């Protein structure tokens, strides 16, 4: 399994337990269902890891759609991109960095 990239919400949870008063991403609601709103800063890290500026948050987001597809999560503009896990086929698809 490769390794010189960053994950996606796998890493950006990772943040979210670090999240300090949250500054990025954390979950937002007092009831449940994760939230996320600086998408940007997370494609930052990207650039970081990637090392490439020809994009930051544009293949970011497209995952995240193929994440709701893969239940591994779900998104809501209910309240912003507040995101949930979807429950179906997490069986192996929730594992922290190596």
């Known amino acids: 399994p490769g390794s010189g990239q960053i994950q ?14 949250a500054s990025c991403i954390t979950w937002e609601g007092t009831n449940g269902e994760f939230k996320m709103t600086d998408p940007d800063e997370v494609a930052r890290r990207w650039g970081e890891r990637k090392s490439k500026p020809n994009m930051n948050y544009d293949k970011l987001s497209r995952a995240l759609r193929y994440y709701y597809d893969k239940n591994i999560m779900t998104k809501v503009h209910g309240k912003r991109y507040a995101y949930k896990f979807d ?3 997490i069986a192996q698809a929730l594992q922290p960095h190596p």
Request: glycine content about 6%.
């Open 8 to 21: 996606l919400w796998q890493f950006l949870l990772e943040l979210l337990s670090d999240s300090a008063n």
């Open 87 to 89: 429950f179906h086929g």
